[PDB]
Amino acid sequence: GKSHGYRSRTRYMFQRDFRKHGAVHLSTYLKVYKVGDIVDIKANGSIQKGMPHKFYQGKTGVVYNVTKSSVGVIINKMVGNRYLEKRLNLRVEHIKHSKCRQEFLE
Amino acid sequence: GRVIRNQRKGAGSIFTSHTRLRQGAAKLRTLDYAERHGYIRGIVKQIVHDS
Amino acid sequence: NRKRPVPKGATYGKPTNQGVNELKYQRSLRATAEERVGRRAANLRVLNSYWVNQDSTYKYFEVILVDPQHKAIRRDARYNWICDPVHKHREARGLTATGKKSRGINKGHKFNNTKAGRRKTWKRQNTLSLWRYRK
Amino acid sequence: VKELLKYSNETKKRNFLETVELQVGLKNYDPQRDKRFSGSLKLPNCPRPNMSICIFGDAFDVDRAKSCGVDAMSVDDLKKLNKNKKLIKKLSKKYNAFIASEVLIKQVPRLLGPQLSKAGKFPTPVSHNDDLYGKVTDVRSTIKFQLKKVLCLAVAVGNVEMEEDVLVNQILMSVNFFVSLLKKNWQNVGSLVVKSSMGPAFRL
Amino acid sequence: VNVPKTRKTYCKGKTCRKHTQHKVTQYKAGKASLFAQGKRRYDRKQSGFGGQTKPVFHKKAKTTKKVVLRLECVKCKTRAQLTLKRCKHFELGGEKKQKGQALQF
RNA sequence: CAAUUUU
RNA sequence: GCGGAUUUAGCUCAGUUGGGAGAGCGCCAGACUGAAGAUCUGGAGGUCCUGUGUUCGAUCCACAGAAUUCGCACCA
RNA sequence: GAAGACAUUGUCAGGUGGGGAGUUUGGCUGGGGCGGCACAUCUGUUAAACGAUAACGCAGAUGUCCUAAGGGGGGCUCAUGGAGAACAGAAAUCUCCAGUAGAACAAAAGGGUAAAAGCCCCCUUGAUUUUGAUUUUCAGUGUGAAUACAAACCAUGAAAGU
RNA sequence: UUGACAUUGUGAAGAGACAUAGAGGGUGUAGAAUAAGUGGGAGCUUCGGCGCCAGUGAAAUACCACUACCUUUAUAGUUUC
RNA sequence: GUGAUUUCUGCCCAGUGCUCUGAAUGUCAAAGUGAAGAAAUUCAACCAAGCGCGGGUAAACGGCGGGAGUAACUAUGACU
């Protein structure tokens, strides 16, 4: 048989990046996500409840709706010849704001 | 398969009994009145070989 | 019940027709008491027939039948369709009393596929008509 | 029906010869099996009383024993420890109360042979204490049934007339029906016979 | 797997529409079948010759079959279902397993 | 009715 | 799937109010004979497949389960 | 003469029936057959630092199990090592100190966890109901599986929440 | 091969079976008796015997109201071999 | 079925097949009887043959293996 599981061949991406153990730093729960903002994705193996997939790692997208601890984002993914605007759904810990639109903002 | 050789027998095809030298039916007289109320006197003529 | 001839019970076909001993012979048991009269009384004409008795294995019928060429029947106009040679052996092609129900002909919604003779109303609808000015 | 006027009009009057108290009993016919499914159960409603002569082994010591004095027979206390082991063997009705909800410690030694044990087959600590005074002296079957059927009570007093045995008979009719399935036979009660002590045999 | 009775949960209902008692049971198929359309469209094809029209089944592979427990309300007395997943041995009674005292090899 | 051995 | 059948100290018959775990065969001891043998008795073993009811109490009357076959069918 | 309403004859029903008929007898395969399942899945690696990827490559696993081993709340420190106390020893229970996880978390491997997600108590059934969206496999089909809601009903906690 | 039905008509005897009546008896203890029933009772009776408020046994003990289980039996009604 | 004569045809009936004038309900067709209901219909009992059970059967199909201990030194095992 062959490995095509939901988090196969991704041993090294969900380690919590050693000497950085413990729980989540509590600046991540005092920060706003309004619709139209631009964010990245970086998965943490602290909470096993709402990871992004193996693929959607280090990629940038706009948010489109929010709920009590949830942010849905838009990522372009390809199948051979086209792009498709995926519409994911994430727990808010795995998201940093993408620090790229300050040097265009400011 | 084929019909085995105790099935092709019972058709009268070639297995008919050879019937050239059989002199006649080896069987005796039926009941006349002269048989169950007395006697009638026979006389042997010859003894033969029924083949 | 009729069983088909089939030497030593062999069918030689797909197993739906493989069974032998309980076919039914779609014509009536009265209409085969009319052919073997009709094919020895060849000069007569049979008007109709009926039932009389049933023992263990026989089912007697008593066929009434008409002389067509008799001189009282060629005149005396109540029966001048029998001399008309369209009714020559009107039992063997099935147009007697059981020739008009075992052939299947009655009016109605439940006498449909045999309403005017099956083979005409088979080859009249799964033919396809093609006009000059095709529609 | 078992009487319109059939065989219970005249055979009740010339047996006024034994002046002893006459109540003709009753059984019926319902087959069952070696289980204990729906036999001598289903406490019925009989409005005519018994005017019984038995004893009541009461367990109630609140000063509403004023009410137990006029509605019952024998008023005891909770010193049941050593006497009542093999003493009562002829006991019809008992009624106890809410103080004895756990003081069944010394009645289960004696209630094994006469078999009116304080399990779910003889529930004497009854909550509501106003319906359980007048009717409840009347005989109606509350017992564990032996192997196939026990369905019993006395029909009526031979002295007391037939004023209500045409309508309470109609709720004498409804006993065994509405809990078991139709494994019960139909027309359980059939030909009715009357013999208290003096009556002859008659089959309807 | 050990399951209890009494299963206090959401009745479907129209009376309560609220969490009430449900004393569970477990059902088999009941009566199998008779005169139900896809059984007597099937006896039409069996009758006669040919034999064994529609496919009989020989390749069995499973061992456990999906124990399904049907609920039963006690106020409106309706009957809803739920399915537990596959298990080989299934009871419906006691032995609330206390913690690791009684080992005794 | 049935009974084996004693360098 | 579905209806019956049997599970007993190691093994086989036991065992039917329900009061009774017994016999035989396996280890150990006593007897018997002048002794060896064979033969006799005794020592002990048992959850009567289990659980619940049944009942004064059950192998015995049941229901459920575990195992062993007998049969009987067969639209995913 | 026999025999007699039994046989025979016909219809229907069961049993026997390779005598006879019709058919089928997989696939992947360093020829084919045998062996095996690489025929659905899952874990780490070969995989060439986004993703995708092969061989009868590598080392393993699955067709279960769970009234709690689920859910919540409260409360405790683990494996080991040093040191001690009658029987007590290489291994028994009680106590002190060190103790970043070297233990445990049903079941293979990998990730993850410390006033826990480990262990000990208390209470419970959200292991409900109505249909939708979304991610992985994808042709961006389905099934399997999972994430976040809304409308209701509730469990726990002091509530926030869960 | 086996059964059912026609084919197919007229008889006697035997034997069951089935219900309908009726019938007698019936285990470990005690109570007062070879104790298989019930809800109950305390008396009709030539007895004042048996009961009971008396013992004791799983049981209450004369009576079935209705049968549990029998055939062991008797007759006609249902048929069957 | 073996293949003149001579001389022999050992043991095994548990499997398979055949047979049997054995006994029970253990299963077992349609039809027929009975109960319910208003009926179509459901349920129950009787349930023939054959299976099953027990026996017979090898000039019927066939089969003929193992393991311990024991004989004066070993060895082997007449013996159980």
Ligand SMILES: [Zn+2]
């Ligand atoms: Zn409800």
